[PDB]
Design a protein around this nucleic acid. Structure first.
Ligand SMILES: [Mg+2]
Ligand SMILES: [Mg+2]
Ligand SMILES: [Mg+2]
Ligand SMILES: [Mg+2]
Ligand SMILES: [Mg+2]
Ligand SMILES: [Mg+2]
Ligand SMILES: [Mg+2]
Ligand SMILES: [Mg+2]
Ligand SMILES: [Mg+2]
Ligand SMILES: [Mg+2]
Ligand SMILES: [Mg+2]
Ligand SMILES: [Mg+2]
Ligand SMILES: [Mg+2]
Ligand SMILES: [Mg+2]
Ligand SMILES: [Mg+2]
Ligand SMILES: [Mg+2]
Ligand SMILES: [Mg+2]
Ligand SMILES: [Mg+2]
Ligand SMILES: [Mg+2]
Ligand SMILES: [Mg+2]
Ligand SMILES: [Mg+2]
Ligand SMILES: [Mg+2]
Ligand SMILES: [Mg+2]
Ligand SMILES: [Mg+2]
Ligand SMILES: [Mg+2]
Ligand SMILES: [Mg+2]
Ligand SMILES: [Mg+2]
Ligand SMILES: [Mg+2]
Ligand SMILES: [Mg+2]
Ligand SMILES: [Mg+2]
Ligand SMILES: [Mg+2]
Ligand SMILES: [Mg+2]
Ligand SMILES: [Mg+2]
Ligand SMILES: [Mg+2]
Ligand SMILES: [Mg+2]
Ligand SMILES: [Mg+2]
Ligand SMILES: [Mg+2]
Ligand SMILES: [Mg+2]
Ligand SMILES: [Mg+2]
Ligand SMILES: [Mg+2]
Ligand SMILES: [Mg+2]
Ligand SMILES: [Mg+2]
Ligand SMILES: [Mg+2]
Ligand SMILES: [Mg+2]
Ligand SMILES: [Mg+2]
Ligand SMILES: [Mg+2]
Ligand SMILES: [Mg+2]
Ligand SMILES: [Mg+2]
Ligand SMILES: [Mg+2]
Ligand SMILES: [Mg+2]
Ligand SMILES: [Mg+2]
Ligand SMILES: [Mg+2]
Ligand SMILES: [Mg+2]
Ligand SMILES: [Mg+2]
Ligand SMILES: [Mg+2]
Ligand SMILES: [Mg+2]
Ligand SMILES: [Mg+2]
Ligand SMILES: [Mg+2]
Ligand SMILES: [Mg+2]
Ligand SMILES: [Mg+2]
Ligand SMILES: [Mg+2]
Ligand SMILES: [Mg+2]
Ligand SMILES: [Mg+2]
Ligand SMILES: [Mg+2]
Ligand SMILES: [Mg+2]
Ligand SMILES: [Mg+2]
Ligand SMILES: [Mg+2]
Ligand SMILES: [Mg+2]
Ligand SMILES: [Mg+2]
Ligand SMILES: [Mg+2]
Ligand SMILES: [Mg+2]
Ligand SMILES: [Mg+2]
Ligand SMILES: [Mg+2]
Ligand SMILES: [Mg+2]
Ligand SMILES: [Mg+2]
Ligand SMILES: [Mg+2]
Ligand SMILES: [Mg+2]
Ligand SMILES: [Mg+2]
Ligand SMILES: [Mg+2]
Ligand SMILES: [Mg+2]
Ligand SMILES: [Mg+2]
Ligand SMILES: [Mg+2]
Ligand SMILES: [Mg+2]
Ligand SMILES: [Mg+2]
Ligand SMILES: [Mg+2]
Ligand SMILES: [Mg+2]
Ligand SMILES: [Mg+2]
Ligand SMILES: [Mg+2]
Ligand SMILES: [Mg+2]
Ligand SMILES: [Mg+2]
Ligand SMILES: [Mg+2]
Ligand SMILES: [Mg+2]
Ligand SMILES: [Mg+2]
Ligand SMILES: [Mg+2]
Ligand SMILES: [Mg+2]
Ligand SMILES: [Mg+2]
Ligand SMILES: [Mg+2]
Ligand SMILES: [Mg+2]
Ligand SMILES: [Mg+2]
Ligand SMILES: [Mg+2]
Ligand SMILES: [Mg+2]
Ligand SMILES: [Mg+2]
Ligand SMILES: [Mg+2]
Ligand SMILES: [Mg+2]
Ligand SMILES: [Mg+2]
Ligand SMILES: [Mg+2]
Ligand SMILES: [Mg+2]
Ligand SMILES: [Mg+2]
Ligand SMILES: [Mg+2]
Ligand SMILES: [Mg+2]
Ligand SMILES: [Mg+2]
Ligand SMILES: [Mg+2]
Ligand SMILES: [Mg+2]
Ligand SMILES: [Mg+2]
Ligand SMILES: [Mg+2]
Ligand SMILES: [Mg+2]
Ligand SMILES: [Mg+2]
Ligand SMILES: [Mg+2]
Ligand SMILES: [Mg+2]
Ligand SMILES: [Mg+2]
Ligand SMILES: [Mg+2]
Ligand SMILES: [Mg+2]
Ligand SMILES: [Mg+2]
Ligand SMILES: [Mg+2]
Ligand SMILES: [Mg+2]
Ligand SMILES: [Mg+2]
Ligand SMILES: [Mg+2]
Ligand SMILES: [Mg+2]
Ligand SMILES: [Mg+2]
Ligand SMILES: [Mg+2]
Ligand SMILES: [Mg+2]
Ligand SMILES: [Mg+2]
Ligand SMILES: [Mg+2]
Ligand SMILES: [Mg+2]
Ligand SMILES: [Mg+2]
Ligand SMILES: [Mg+2]
Ligand SMILES: [Mg+2]
Ligand SMILES: [Mg+2]
Ligand SMILES: [Mg+2]
Ligand SMILES: [Mg+2]
Ligand SMILES: [Mg+2]
Ligand SMILES: [Mg+2]
Ligand SMILES: [Mg+2]
Ligand SMILES: [Mg+2]
Ligand SMILES: [Mg+2]
Ligand SMILES: [Mg+2]
Ligand SMILES: [Mg+2]
Ligand SMILES: [Mg+2]
Ligand SMILES: [Mg+2]
Ligand SMILES: [Mg+2]
Ligand SMILES: [Mg+2]
Ligand SMILES: [Mg+2]
Ligand SMILES: [Mg+2]
Ligand SMILES: [Mg+2]
Ligand SMILES: [Mg+2]
Ligand SMILES: [Mg+2]
Ligand SMILES: [Mg+2]
Ligand SMILES: [Mg+2]
Ligand SMILES: [Mg+2]
Ligand SMILES: [Mg+2]
Ligand SMILES: [Mg+2]
Ligand SMILES: [Mg+2]
Ligand SMILES: [Mg+2]
Ligand SMILES: [Mg+2]
Ligand SMILES: [Mg+2]
Ligand SMILES: [Mg+2]
Ligand SMILES: [Mg+2]
Ligand SMILES: [Mg+2]
Ligand SMILES: [Mg+2]
Ligand SMILES: [Mg+2]
Ligand SMILES: [Mg+2]
Ligand SMILES: [Mg+2]
Ligand SMILES: [Mg+2]
Ligand SMILES: [Mg+2]
Ligand SMILES: [Mg+2]
Ligand SMILES: [Mg+2]
Ligand SMILES: [Mg+2]
Ligand SMILES: [Mg+2]
Ligand SMILES: [Mg+2]
Ligand SMILES: [Mg+2]
Ligand SMILES: [Mg+2]
Ligand SMILES: [Mg+2]
Ligand SMILES: [Mg+2]
Ligand SMILES: [Mg+2]
Ligand SMILES: [Mg+2]
Ligand SMILES: [Mg+2]
Ligand SMILES: [Mg+2]
Ligand SMILES: [Mg+2]
Ligand SMILES: [Mg+2]
Ligand SMILES: [Mg+2]
Ligand SMILES: [Mg+2]
Ligand SMILES: [Mg+2]
Ligand SMILES: [Mg+2]
Ligand SMILES: [Mg+2]
Ligand SMILES: [Mg+2]
Ligand SMILES: [Mg+2]
Ligand SMILES: [Mg+2]
Ligand SMILES: [Mg+2]
Ligand SMILES: [Mg+2]
Ligand SMILES: [Mg+2]
Ligand SMILES: [Mg+2]
Ligand SMILES: [Mg+2]
Ligand SMILES: [Mg+2]
Ligand SMILES: [Mg+2]
Ligand SMILES: [Mg+2]
Ligand SMILES: [Mg+2]
Ligand SMILES: [Mg+2]
Ligand SMILES: [Mg+2]
Ligand SMILES: [Mg+2]
Ligand SMILES: [Mg+2]
Ligand SMILES: [Mg+2]
Ligand SMILES: [Mg+2]
Ligand SMILES: [Mg+2]
Ligand SMILES: [Mg+2]
Ligand SMILES: [Mg+2]
Ligand SMILES: [Mg+2]
Ligand SMILES: [Mg+2]
Ligand SMILES: [Mg+2]
Ligand SMILES: [Mg+2]
Ligand SMILES: [Mg+2]
Ligand SMILES: [Mg+2]
Ligand SMILES: [Mg+2]
Ligand SMILES: [Mg+2]
Ligand SMILES: [Mg+2]
Ligand SMILES: [Mg+2]
Ligand SMILES: [Mg+2]
Ligand SMILES: [Mg+2]
Ligand SMILES: [Mg+2]
Ligand SMILES: [Mg+2]
Ligand SMILES: [Mg+2]
Ligand SMILES: [Mg+2]
Ligand SMILES: [Mg+2]
Ligand SMILES: [Mg+2]
Ligand SMILES: [Mg+2]
Ligand SMILES: [Mg+2]
Ligand SMILES: [Mg+2]
Ligand SMILES: [Zn+2]
Lengths: 131, 118, 122, 204, 59
RNA sequence: CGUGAGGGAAAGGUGAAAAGAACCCCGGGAGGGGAGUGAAAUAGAGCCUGAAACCGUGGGCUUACAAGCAGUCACGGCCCC
RNA sequence: GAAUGCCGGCAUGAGUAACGAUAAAGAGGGUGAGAAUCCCUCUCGCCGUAAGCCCAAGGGUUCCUACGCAAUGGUCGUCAG
RNA sequence: CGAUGUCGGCUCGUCGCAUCCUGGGGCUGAAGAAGGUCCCAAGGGUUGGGCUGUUCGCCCAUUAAAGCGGCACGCGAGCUGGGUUCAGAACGUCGUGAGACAGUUCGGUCUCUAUCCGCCACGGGCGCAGGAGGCUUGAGGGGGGCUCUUCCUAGUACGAGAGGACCGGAAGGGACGCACCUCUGGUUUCCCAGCUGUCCCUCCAGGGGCAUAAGCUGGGUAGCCAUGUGCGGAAGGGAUAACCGCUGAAAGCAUCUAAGCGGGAAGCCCGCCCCAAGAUGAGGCCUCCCACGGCAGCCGGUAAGGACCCGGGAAGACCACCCGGUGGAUGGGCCGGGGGUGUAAGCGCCGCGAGGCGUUGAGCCGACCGGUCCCAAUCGUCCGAGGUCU
């Protein structure tokens, strides 16, 4: 048998390809399916993806944001059906795969340490032109 | 427990082990065949094999990578001009380890021979 | 993941700023409180002249934790501090405003008035 | 009491009703019936099953003639499901439907020689305050002259794991017959590639 | 600790009984297919240097 | 041994005579096997006699469902004369 | 037959603890009856206000060379105070 | 008294029941809910803190409950050493004094090696009348055994009102236990990168050593893991305890009883999970091999089979166990994927320069999922029945 292939086969029916690629340092807007009462709504969560933990169908990404004076981090399954869609808000550029260090930085320093990744900003605008 | 852990320790701390492998790589790439204990011989296989493969790619990058372990430019030139060409179509298996008959007198250490292949 | 000795921020306008957990009010011997759990704390710091003051033995529900909480959707959330809100014996908030976001778990566990008062529920 | 022999392939989590469901994947089918245990012959009722085809060169003579007696190809593993008499000669994942509850028997992962803190969750000793080379030690193991001995069954250091463990009342999450595949919510004993046995649960 | 010590001398019988697992097992030896000398299997023959049907060593 | 005053051992025997074993054989040597000396060589120098504890090789009987200050009384089996 | 007796011999514990700084080794080549352990080369590591050099005490041939390996050397030894 | 280590604590349990809780009852000055009191019951449970060496106790915050006792005031060849319990010191007090005080005070050496029994684990042997490869029965053991909240019933019965059920039915917890690694979170001694000082290769560039047994720093796969995940306590059947009855004499009535029959506990037996035929009472089923020569014994040669040896392994101290040995994917390599790291070197361009931009998600790259005979499991060796008797 191919146990790895068997697992990739179980996972296949839930894999997802609608979502835009991103990197640590990109600011992202995750539209998330949320339930409360008596309804379910889409709550937008926006911030810097500080970690992309890779394991295939099982990869997760962790986004960090300030919400009324308090740091909030959100871990998401990259193939969750609860994500309506993902919006690339801004392309950051890191030198580092995990950006935990921004938890200890002022907003000034984060801005100084996570500058616009002009390359992938242009890359986005370039192939943003369809027939 | 040691479940699914690859690699021997050989009762050497991290950098003594790395030095052990490297020095054994020099001696092998030098003389073509050496005698060691069976366990060291089994572990040398993969360490030297990798350096040979890099010698096949033959680019500059490979040569500096290989020089991290072998350090000796003359020897690396041998690995690139002499050793590696006789392995162009041989994909893997550049060494072999054959156990030897008689243990070492003072400590009973089982010995083997490690060589580059024809 | 709050246990006795733990200091928590005070996310309301009651007057307390810091409380030190002295009990997880969850059965006879729970080790930890998380979002939606109620604690007994002592007020270790308070701004002058509030409803609650230093020395008081108060009750509070944990509204956000620094340990990340796991949700049935397979996602998880985590805040930069541990904060609570002082309650009376009916779970109702003793203050009149609550600061910063609160976990949505408060809703299920019946802390509706804190959840509405919250500027954000995440 | 239906049952099937299996291989533990691996874990993942599926999404079912906005809920990440941790599952373990089991390659269970197909199991040829090899011998039947009847009360007239053997005194009880069971079905001997087979699993995983074997290189027929590797099957020695007494095993061979056992397969031919009930015309079946050489198989790597024989195991019995007590009190199970399926009507065909083959047992496949189809005997479970999703929503059923199962018990899974496998061989646990082996810790080898295990200390008292890992094996029995003993508390060990203090790590400071003068504690003297007893940080993982058991403590007292008895009394004094009365009884002047150590109890049978005393919890002590020894081999831990690589033992038959059954986890009970696991939910069958899906059944993929095209791959002899069974998904079960939750954890199952043993390492990936382990032999396992999946039976209908004993919990009403 | 408090220096545990033997309580009695061990008897000739008990001590020899402990030694009932100390016998050596003899070397496992096969014939070298070329010089017929006895040698450990899976080793290069030390008598003629042959292994897997070819000369590998000077000897 | 103790700085010192001072303390303070162990250890005798081939044979009548060295005739103290040429030479050969295995062995690096030690050691041994022959040859040779001798009334005698488990008198061969690690030497008169050579007890006991302790260690070993060979043989007889016996022993892996059994409870023991180890013996003793009885009977039976096996071995020996 | 006992005096925790005296002297000596020899057991048990036991093929057990240990083999004395966690600065570290690997290979090739030679010598030899025999080599992880001696010599030589290459590689690697350690000390460098020393783990290098000189002097004074103290020790008293340990120095150099040749020839050796029974014992001494915590293993081995062809090497050595 | 040629020594039976002394308090308390920690650790580790185990037992008694005069029961703290949970379960089952009778009486109540039991309306309900909540109590009181006695009976039955030891299966499980019986929290975290302040003080003090403390045992105990008091207090804080909880709890279903914060039970009492035994085991050398259980446990120092298991740990501690605060107290007590030498030698120093001081205070109070006593003594002319030296000294003295279950009075106070500060300080004060707790011994690497387990022989036997016992206990936890793991083998080796021989046995289980032929010899073998499997699969199994379960005698007999062990493990487990907890409990709370809310809601529905119904704001009903009950009560003037406050309050507030039985029975039955849902959901959600705490602690505990087994297993696990998908997620969450650790570790990840060299998998990647960044950085300092220095010495070196080779001058630059690029690298290497050392700064720990990783020089430091930021990350981190598999594995091993809890803080993470799944699942467990049951259900159910049987017999009972106190207790309640049915029918019923002796004793025209009456009586659970003398004959007989019901009901009835978290307890007991089974039922769940694990071990188990050395269960010498050595069990059973399926299959394989066989009447081999020479002289219930013996000497071999073979059978079925096994062992040796070797490549290994989430198996493991050795051993065992499991897989594989060219008829082969067992480890090593190499190839693809995963994964980590986070854009290598070199060259080009910008800049005086430190650098920056591009080539480029590059290059490197442990274990994970596979492929591939390139390298190594060469060649072989030794065991091993001929079936006791009624
Ligand atoms: Mg996988
Ligand atoms: Mg497939
Ligand atoms: Mg919103
Ligand atoms: Mg932000
Ligand atoms: Mg959607
Ligand atoms: Mg293990
Ligand atoms: Mg370890
Ligand atoms: Mg492997
Ligand atoms: Mg390595
Ligand atoms: Mg290893
Ligand atoms: Mg190894
Ligand atoms: Mg090591
Ligand atoms: Mg070693
Ligand atoms: Mg070493
Ligand atoms: Mg190390
Ligand atoms: Mg180092
Ligand atoms: Mg080193
Ligand atoms: Mg070999
Ligand atoms: Mg060998
Ligand atoms: Mg030697
Ligand atoms: Mg605040
Ligand atoms: Mg199994
Ligand atoms: Mg331990
Ligand atoms: Mg543990
Ligand atoms: Mg455990
Ligand atoms: Mg502890
Ligand atoms: Mg601890
Ligand atoms: Mg402590
Ligand atoms: Mg100490
Ligand atoms: Mg101590
Ligand atoms: Mg100590
Ligand atoms: Mg310590
Ligand atoms: Mg202990
Ligand atoms: Mg005691
Ligand atoms: Mg006793
Ligand atoms: Mg085991
Ligand atoms: Mg499904
Ligand atoms: Mg596994
Ligand atoms: Mg001790
Ligand atoms: Mg002690
Ligand atoms: Mg001891
Ligand atoms: Mg000690
Ligand atoms: Mg001792
Ligand atoms: Mg003793
Ligand atoms: Mg004897
Ligand atoms: Mg003796
Ligand atoms: Mg004897
Ligand atoms: Mg013995
Ligand atoms: Mg020769
Ligand atoms: Mg003196
Ligand atoms: Mg003198
Ligand atoms: Mg004297
Ligand atoms: Mg004398
Ligand atoms: Mg004398
Ligand atoms: Mg004489
Ligand atoms: Mg004389
Ligand atoms: Mg005479
Ligand atoms: Mg000679
Ligand atoms: Mg000669
Ligand atoms: Mg001689
Ligand atoms: Mg001789
Ligand atoms: Mg002679
Ligand atoms: Mg003569
Ligand atoms: Mg005469
Ligand atoms: Mg005579
Ligand atoms: Mg004589
Ligand atoms: Mg004589
Ligand atoms: Mg005489
Ligand atoms: Mg004599
Ligand atoms: Mg003598
Ligand atoms: Mg004998
Ligand atoms: Mg018996
Ligand atoms: Mg017998
Ligand atoms: Mg008798
Ligand atoms: Mg008689
Ligand atoms: Mg006497
Ligand atoms: Mg004595
Ligand atoms: Mg004595
Ligand atoms: Mg004595
Ligand atoms: Mg004496
Ligand atoms: Mg005497
Ligand atoms: Mg004496
Ligand atoms: Mg003596
Ligand atoms: Mg001795
Ligand atoms: Mg040994
Ligand atoms: Mg011992
Ligand atoms: Mg030992
Ligand atoms: Mg040792
Ligand atoms: Mg040493
Ligand atoms: Mg030491
Ligand atoms: Mg050290
Ligand atoms: Mg050499
Ligand atoms: Mg040589
Ligand atoms: Mg040597
Ligand atoms: Mg030698
Ligand atoms: Mg030298
Ligand atoms: Mg240095
Ligand atoms: Mg200097
Ligand atoms: Mg002088
Ligand atoms: Mg001197
Ligand atoms: Mg001299
Ligand atoms: Mg001189
Ligand atoms: Mg001299
Ligand atoms: Mg000299
Ligand atoms: Mg010389
Ligand atoms: Mg010598
Ligand atoms: Mg010598
Ligand atoms: Mg010698
Ligand atoms: Mg001499
Ligand atoms: Mg010596
Ligand atoms: Mg020596
Ligand atoms: Mg010495
Ligand atoms: Mg010599
Ligand atoms: Mg010397
Ligand atoms: Mg006494
Ligand atoms: Mg004595
Ligand atoms: Mg005594
Ligand atoms: Mg004594
Ligand atoms: Mg004593
Ligand atoms: Mg007790
Ligand atoms: Mg009672
Ligand atoms: Mg009660
Ligand atoms: Mg009750
Ligand atoms: Mg009532
Ligand atoms: Mg009332
Ligand atoms: Mg009552
Ligand atoms: Mg009563
Ligand atoms: Mg109880
Ligand atoms: Mg009990
Ligand atoms: Mg109790
Ligand atoms: Mg308490
Ligand atoms: Mg305090
Ligand atoms: Mg305290
Ligand atoms: Mg305390
Ligand atoms: Mg106290
Ligand atoms: Mg006490
Ligand atoms: Mg008191
Ligand atoms: Mg309460
Ligand atoms: Mg209660
Ligand atoms: Mg007691
Ligand atoms: Mg006592
Ligand atoms: Mg007492
Ligand atoms: Mg007392
Ligand atoms: Mg005591
Ligand atoms: Mg006590
Ligand atoms: Mg004690
Ligand atoms: Mg002690
Ligand atoms: Mg004590
Ligand atoms: Mg004791
Ligand atoms: Mg003791
Ligand atoms: Mg003890
Ligand atoms: Mg004792
Ligand atoms: Mg203590
Ligand atoms: Mg003290
Ligand atoms: Mg004190
Ligand atoms: Mg006191
Ligand atoms: Mg004291
Ligand atoms: Mg005292
Ligand atoms: Mg004294
Ligand atoms: Mg004192
Ligand atoms: Mg004192
Ligand atoms: Mg005074
Ligand atoms: Mg006084
Ligand atoms: Mg006085
Ligand atoms: Mg006076
Ligand atoms: Mg006075
Ligand atoms: Mg006195
Ligand atoms: Mg005193
Ligand atoms: Mg006192
Ligand atoms: Mg008193
Ligand atoms: Mg006193
Ligand atoms: Mg002090
Ligand atoms: Mg004192
Ligand atoms: Mg001692
Ligand atoms: Mg020892
Ligand atoms: Mg022992
Ligand atoms: Mg005993
Ligand atoms: Mg056995
Ligand atoms: Mg055996
Ligand atoms: Mg027999
Ligand atoms: Mg028994
Ligand atoms: Mg039973
Ligand atoms: Mg039972
Ligand atoms: Mg209602
Ligand atoms: Mg109910
Ligand atoms: Mg429940
Ligand atoms: Mg994983
Ligand atoms: Mg993880
Ligand atoms: Mg994960
Ligand atoms: Mg993680
Ligand atoms: Mg590296
Ligand atoms: Mg450097
Ligand atoms: Mg330079
Ligand atoms: Mg440079
Ligand atoms: Mg250096
Ligand atoms: Mg170092
Ligand atoms: Mg480094
Ligand atoms: Mg740093
Ligand atoms: Mg790190
Ligand atoms: Mg980390
Ligand atoms: Mg990892
Ligand atoms: Mg946990
Ligand atoms: Mg539960
Ligand atoms: Mg009646
Ligand atoms: Mg009756
Ligand atoms: Mg009844
Ligand atoms: Mg009844
Ligand atoms: Mg009734
Ligand atoms: Mg009944
Ligand atoms: Mg229950
Ligand atoms: Mg079984
Ligand atoms: Mg049997
Ligand atoms: Mg069995
Ligand atoms: Mg019996
Ligand atoms: Mg049988
Ligand atoms: Mg049967
Ligand atoms: Mg065969
Ligand atoms: Mg192995
Ligand atoms: Mg098998
Ligand atoms: Mg095999
Ligand atoms: Mg073969
Ligand atoms: Mg073959
Ligand atoms: Mg392979
Ligand atoms: Mg491969
Ligand atoms: Mg790969
Ligand atoms: Mg990849
Ligand atoms: Mg990647
Ligand atoms: Mg670049
Ligand atoms: Mg570049
Ligand atoms: Mg320029
Ligand atoms: Mg540019
Ligand atoms: Mg790759
Ligand atoms: Mg690789
Ligand atoms: Mg192929
Ligand atoms: Mg090949
Ligand atoms: Mg052969
Ligand atoms: Zn040969």
């Amino acid at each position: 048998m191919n146990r790895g292939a068997l697992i990739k086969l179980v996972e296949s029916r839930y894999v997802r390809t609608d979502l835009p690629e991103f990197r640590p340092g990109d600011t992202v807007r995750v539209s998330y399916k949320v339930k409360e009462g008596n309804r379910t709504r889409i709550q937008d969560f926006e911030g810097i993806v500080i970690r992309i933990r890779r394991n295939g169908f099982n990869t997760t990404f962790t986004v960090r944001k300030v919400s009324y004076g308090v740091g909030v981090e959100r871990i998401f399954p990259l193939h969750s059906p609860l994500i309506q869609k993902i919006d690339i808000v801004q392309r950051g550029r890191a030198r580092r795969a995990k950006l935990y260090f921004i938890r200890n930085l002022s907003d000034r320093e984060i801005r100084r340490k996570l500058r616009a990744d002009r390359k992938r900003i242009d890359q986005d605008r370039a192939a943003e032109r369809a027939a | 427990m040691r479940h699914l852990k690859s690699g021997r320790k050989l009762n050497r701390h991290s950098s003594h082990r790395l030095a052990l492998y490297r020095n054994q790589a020099k001696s092998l790439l030098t003389h073509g065949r050496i005698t060691t204990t069976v366990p060291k011989a089994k572990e040398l296989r993969g360490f030297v094999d990798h350096l040979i493969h890099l010698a096949k790619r033959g680019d500059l990058h490979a040569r500096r990578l290989v020089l991290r372990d072998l350090q000796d430019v003359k020897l690396v030139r041998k690995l690139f001009d002499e050793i590696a060409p006789r392995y162009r179509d041989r994909q893997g298996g550049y060494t072999r380890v054959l156990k030897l008959a008689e243990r070492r007198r003072g400590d009973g250490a089982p010995l083997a021979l490690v060589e580059l292949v024809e | 993941m709050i246990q006795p000795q733990t200091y928590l921020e005070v996310a309301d306008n009651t007057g307390a700023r810091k409380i030190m957990c002295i009990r997880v009010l969850k059965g006879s011997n729970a080790k930890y409180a998380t979002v939606g759990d109620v604690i007994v704390a002592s007020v270790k710091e308070a701004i002058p002249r509030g409803a609650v003051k230093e020395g008081d033995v108060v009750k509070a529900v944990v509204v956000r934790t620094k340990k990340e909480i796991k949700r049935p959707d397979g996602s998880a959330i985590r805040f930069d501090d541990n904060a609570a809100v002082i309650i009376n014996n009916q779970l109702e908030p003793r203050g009149t405003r609550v600061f910063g976001p609160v976990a949505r778990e408060l809703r299920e566990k019946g802390f509706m008035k804190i959840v509405s008062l919250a500027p954000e529920v995440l | 009491m239906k049952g099937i022999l299996g291989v533990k392939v691996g874990m993942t989590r599926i999404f079912r009703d906005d809920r990440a469901v941790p599952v373990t994947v089991i390659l269970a089918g197909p199991c040829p019936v090899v011998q039947r245990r009847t009360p007239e012959k053997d005194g009880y009722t069971a079905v001997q099953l087979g699993f995983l085809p074997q290189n027929p060169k590797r099957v020695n003579r007494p095993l061979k003639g056992h397969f031919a007696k009930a015309g079946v190809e050489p198989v790597r593993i024989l195991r019995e499901i007590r009190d199970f008499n399926p009507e065909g000669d083959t047992v496949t994942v189809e005997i479970f439907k999703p929503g059923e509850r199962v018990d899974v028997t496998g061989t646990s992962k082996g810790r080898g020689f295990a200390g008292v803190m890992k094996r029995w969750n003993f508390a060990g000793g203090p790590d400071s305050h003068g504690a003297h080379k007893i940080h993982r030690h058991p403590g007292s193991i008895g009394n004094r002259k009365t009884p002047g001995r150590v109890y049978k069954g005393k919890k002590m250091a020894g081999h831990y794991g690589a033992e038959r463990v059954t986890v009970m009342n696991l939910e069958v999450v899906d059944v993929i017959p095209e791959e002899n595949l069974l998904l079960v919510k939750g954890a199952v004993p043993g390492p990936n590639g382990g032999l396992v046995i999946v039976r209908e649960t004993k919990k009403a | 600790a408090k220096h545990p010590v033997p309580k009695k001398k061990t008897s000739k019988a008990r001590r020899d009984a402990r030694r009932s697992h100390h016998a050596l097992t003899p070397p496992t030896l096969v014939p070298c297919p070329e010089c017929k000398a006895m040698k450990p299997p899976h080793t290069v023959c030390p008598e003629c240097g042959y292994y897997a049907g070819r000369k590998v060593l000077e000897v």
